[PDB]
């Protein structure tokens, strides 16, 4: 899926940095391997439909008293891994205290950056403890003109890919010469790298084949 190059499931590993003047979308495009859905997803396509490609620049988050290696059975690369540019921040072990952390990132380029994170709405209230500490979690973001607050939603669901818990991926846009801030202690799917739009192109849809000599 067009948004799959931003999270990078085990299928978009060559379009992490894809350079292009043209985009094609298919009936089997899936932005997700661990079930979920973006929030304001179609908006991102139209911008991405005309982005000319993305330059992955590393964001640089250092995880201390936890894991980063977070993995599940759906988003398999080789065995069981996760999205490429996303550290599934489990607790320290398999229930442990996920302490209160806070990270920030800054833009050093004349172009704006694409910032994507996600909440892990766990399938139960225990599976919210299985990967993070117990007690309520609030992941609130900050910017000079963006101020939000999410609460993970622990609740039963349909099983998609054998998993019932979900991951709702959000995004905002960081202007050149500014920052972003995350304060959290749970249910967080961290970003490793943030996209940078390359220029001008076009995305369409079709369900047919291509031709290059015309």
């Amino acid at each position, epitope marked *: 899926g067009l948004l799959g190059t931003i999270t990078g499931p085990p299928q978009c590993d060559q379009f992490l940095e894809f350079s292009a003047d043209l985009i094609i979308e298919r009936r089997e495009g899936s932005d997700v391997c661990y079930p979920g859905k973006f929030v304001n997803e179609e908006a991102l396509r139209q911008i991405l439909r005309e982005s000319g490609g993305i330059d992955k620049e590393a964001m640089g988050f250092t995880y201390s008293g936890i894991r980063t290696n977070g993995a599940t059975s759906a988003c398999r690369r080789s065995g069981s891994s996760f999205y490429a540019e996303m550290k599934w921040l489990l607790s320290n072990t398999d229930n442990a205290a996920f302490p209160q952390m806070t990270k920030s990132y800054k833009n050093t380029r004349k172009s704006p950056a694409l910032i994507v994170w996600g909440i892990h709405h766990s399938v139960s209230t225990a599976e919210q403890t299985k990967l993070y500490g117990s*007690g309520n979690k609030l992941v609130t973001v900050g910017s000079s003109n963006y101020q939000q607050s999410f609460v993970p939603s622990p609740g039963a669901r349909p099983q998609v890919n054998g998993l019932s818990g979900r991951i709702d991926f959000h995004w905002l846009m960081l202007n050149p010469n500014d920052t972003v801030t995350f304060s959290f202690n749970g249910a967080f799917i961290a970003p490793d790298r943030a996209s940078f739009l390359r220029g001008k192109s076009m995305g369409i849809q079709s369900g047919v084949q291509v031709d290059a000599n015309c």
Partner: antibody, heavy 119, light 115 residues
């Protein structure tokens, strides 16, 4: 009833090696976190290593950094501890395990083994 | 890692004496958003493995009679055997299960009854 038992203890000589072993009874093995704790002769307790549910993660201590090797089995009900380059501070008797989890309870330790690194 | 201590090292307090064991910590063990203390009490007799005594700091484990009680919060606690008994001649430890792959116990303490 849940119960545990350790084995593989005796007399060894330092710079040598041993391979400890646990056995279980009365619970879904494959689903929990498993620890390891040793106690030197009349000393305090010490955490050695653990394995997560899927065995996908292991974390040791610094006294055994590169000297010990914890290992699991879920079909068989066994948790292992290979030892290598034994030293004399490694003289101890070994136990362990908890209940992880949040909520409710638990407990639970084994009966033990005499392991001395006296050549 | 979180380094732990107790006092007194050894107390010889007589039968029926409210024995008071004080125990400290370097780093805090009280999680924020659920407000719970990661502290346990155990009872080992030489050759025996530890037996569970108090958890959540202030929650007794079943099978433990009423004289046992855990108190305190944050970095300092205290076990008060309201009526010290002769069954209670054992070694008691504090333990943290805050950080994870390093559970630090203590220095201990024996409680031998006077006369």
């Amino acid at each position: 009833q849940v119960q545990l038992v350790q084995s593989g203890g005796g007399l060894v000589q330092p710079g040598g090696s041993l391979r400890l072993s646990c056995a279980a009874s009365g619970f879904n093995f494959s689903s929990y976190e498993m620890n390891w704790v040793r106690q030197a002769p009349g000393k305090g307790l010490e955490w050695v290593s653990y394995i997560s549910s899927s065995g996908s993660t292991i974390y040791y201590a610094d006294s055994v950094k590169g000297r010990f090797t914890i290992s699991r089995d879920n079909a068989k009900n066994s948790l292992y501890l290979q030892m290598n380059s034994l030293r004399a501070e490694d003289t101890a008797v070994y136990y362990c395990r908890l209940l992880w989890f949040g909520e409710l309870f638990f407990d639970y330790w084994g009966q033990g083994t005499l392991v001395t690194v006296s050549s | 890692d979180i380094v732990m201590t107790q006092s007194p090292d050894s107390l010889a307090v007589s039968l029926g004496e409210r024995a008071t064991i004080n125990c400290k910590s370097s780093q805090s063990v009280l999680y924020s958003s659920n407000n719970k203390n990661y502290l346990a009490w155990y009872q080992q007799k030489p050759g025996q493995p530890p037996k569970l005594l108090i958890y959540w700091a202030s929650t007794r484990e079943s099978g433990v009679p009423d004289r046992f009680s855990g108190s305190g919060s944050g970095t300092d606690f205290t076990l008060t055997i309201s009526s010290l008994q002769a069954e209670d001649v054992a070694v008691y430890y504090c333990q943290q299960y805050y950080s994870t792959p390093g559970l630090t116990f203590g220095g201990g303490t024996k409680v031998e009854i006077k006369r």
